[PDB]
Amino acid sequence: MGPGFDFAQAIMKKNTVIARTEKGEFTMLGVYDRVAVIPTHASVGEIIYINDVETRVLDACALRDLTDTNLEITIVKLDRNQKFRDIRHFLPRCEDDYNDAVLSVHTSKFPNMYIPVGQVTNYGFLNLGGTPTHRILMYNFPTRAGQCGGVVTTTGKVIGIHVGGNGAQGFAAMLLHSYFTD
Ligand SMILES: CCOC(=O)c1cn[nH]c1
């Protein structure tokens, strides 16, 4: 409906796949080459389904900060025959607060879903499902089961992936440029 939704749609159309693990279906953001991200609670194994294609996982790493605290981001390298558009230049370099963010989801349950979530707080520490977590972004929208892995964007920036909610607020794990240097 406006430039927020336009950027979000462009990221969804070229840089997302539907990932299925034994824990469910997730929006999965492709970042560059065969490298993508997914919430760590997806419990990625040796094999994953990507748009219903059986796919070998070449490498997977659950990120933690240098305090050895969960970040809830798993980086996956996929044995896929096609590279993602490189979007690393849209990733923030530093922890920050944001205005006017969109959360976008694409699954069998929620196809072509875009939610204007508004102001995004650098929340920091969250006890996420009992697990102490750092670098959490917070927004005031009642997000639901099925939106995890959803991409959080502003105009011109890909800032996080949805990892949970409490019924009133939603929470995303930050994406930072430094995660994807090669
Ligand atoms: C289909 C209706 O959707 C909602 O009301 C919603 C989705 N997430 N949070 C609220």
Residues 164 and 181 occupy one common structural domain: yes
Burial annotation 108-137 (CB, 10 A radius, 16+ → b, else e): eebeebbbebeebeebeebebeeeebbbbb
Q: Which residues line ligand 1 (CB under 6 A)?
A: 142-144
- Full domain range(s) for residue 141: 1-15+85-182
Method: X-ray
Pocket perturbation via mutation, ligand 1, pick of 144, 152, 162, 171 by most ligand atoms within 8 A of CB: 144
66, 110: one domain: no
Find all residues with CB under 8 Å of 50, minimum gap 6, and list them. 17, 18, 19, 28, 78, 80
Last residue of a domain, one of 49, 84, 119: 84
Are 43 and 104 contained in the same domain?
A: no
For residues 89 and 174, membership in a common domain is answered with yes
Q: Tell me the structure's resolution in angstroms, rounded to a single decimal.
A: 1.4
Q: How far is CA 162 from CA 58, 90, 144, 158, 176, in A?
A: 24, 17, 10, 12, 14
Spatial neighbors of 116 by CB under 8 A, at least 6 apart, are 4, 5, 100, 101, 102
Judgement on whether residues 25 and 54 belong to the same structural domain of the protein = yes
Of 33, 43, 44, 31, which is closest to residue 79 (Cα–Cα)? 33
